[model samples]
Target: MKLFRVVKRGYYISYAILDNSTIIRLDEDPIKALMRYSENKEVLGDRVTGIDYQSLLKSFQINDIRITKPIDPPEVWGSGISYENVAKILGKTIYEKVYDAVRPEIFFKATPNRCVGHGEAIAVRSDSEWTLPEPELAVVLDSNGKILGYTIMDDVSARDLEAENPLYLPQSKIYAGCCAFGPVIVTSDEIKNPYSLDITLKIVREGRVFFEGSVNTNKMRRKIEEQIQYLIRDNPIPDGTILTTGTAIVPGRDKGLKDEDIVEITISNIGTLITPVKKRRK
Candidate 1:
């Protein structure tokens, strides 16, 4: 089932997909819905799998829905070098150090204020010379850091800043509106093969296509569970935490995004997450 947190007519609503086109509203907050599952237990296992969606659907009107950030994760973290081509595109020597490192390069990504929902604006820093958006598969984890579901993520990046020096990664990565994800979250039970899904990304500027590419998760070098293990080590993640696996579809230096561009990142089973690009003002 694909779950969504949406805002319509000044109200925030939670919903779960009944099918490709049908969305049934859940009469509760999305975070509260997730917390109820793990309130008694440390981990959130197949609790969502047991939801009585059929009966629940009957009670509420299956209304037309708007999508928003599906979960308000306390912390948003990401894994670097998970995708092989992503390493090569950045710099062979630089990324090899990351890929060969004992622990996978996972970093703190965004706060609730910096992260936005689908159809929102993601900022391009004014100080950076080059910027791009990464299309990735993001995992939703419970408090115990167990996988609960999957979502789409756009790891908006400042490539030039990071390329200058690896130490500048934080400035390149974290900023106002630099991270975006979610039109909906598909429960793990619905996705039989996570590693084989088709992912596509496209950038449109002034009604013209600027860049387009596709990548398969089959090419990802690291296992999803392995990345998670590193994230939760000696650190506590609250019930609604998201971990974005890295992207392979790099735009390279030639196709950096400009202000007023639009990005569409889509994954099979999970729907498209659309975001507009805006330049940060001085």
Candidate 2:
């Protein structure tokens, strides 16, 4: 089942179960229900059709409400250089080192406030000239590191700032509207094979496709469990934590994002995440 979130009148947040074009707005947050329901299946069965909470559930047209991020992850982490193609294609020795090292490079990505969702406007850094969207597969995990679901992520970054100095990593990565994910979260059970899915990234500008690329997840060098193990070791993470596996569909400086560009990223199993790009207002 796919899980989604949206805002109704007056900014009231709610959760729903998306089945193709229809959405079943659940009485409670879907993620919370999924995590707790595992312990008590009879109370809230994994499927909505089960003889539980049927009366309280209601369905709506996908276009009826404004969609938002599937989950407001308490903490967001990212794995860098998980694909060997990036290390070799970009010719960045540091990326090669991370791919070859025993320990993967995982860093703090964002807070809920820093991220936008599907059909939302992702900010372009006003201070940097070169910014690009790094399309990736994001893994959702419970506090204890158990996989919950998977979603598409746009690891938007300021390449100019990052290339200026290695110490500038935080500034290059952490900024308002730096990250975006979700049209919906595909339950982990449905994605029988995460490593074999196809990922397609496209940036549309001036009413045409400006940059487009495709990469298969089979090119990923790290395992999901291995990345999570390093993230949670000697560190406590809150529930609803999100970790994005590194990206390979990288565009060069020539294809840097511009205002009003539309970035659409799609994974074979998971749904597509479409976000519009804009310059920071403040």
lDDT per residue (tens digit) for residues 1-282 in model 2: 667766656453444454443435456666675575444531232333321212221222243356778788888999998986122335656767777889999899999999998888898888978998999999888888988888999999998887877667889899899999987777776588999999999899978999889999999989889999999999899878899998999898788888999999989977678888988755
lDDT for residue 227 in candidate 1, whole number 0-100:
93
Which candidate number would show the highest TM-score if scored against the true structure? 2
* Tens digits of per-residue lDDT for model 1, 99-170: 777789899999888898887789999997689998999988887777778999999999998888878899
lDDT of 1 at 40: 43
Model 2 bad stretches (over 4 Å):
12-23, 37-64, 85-92
Instruction: Report how far residue 95 has shifted in candidate 1, in Å.
Output: 1.2
Residue pairs in collision within model 1:
none
TM-score of each: 0.84, 0.86
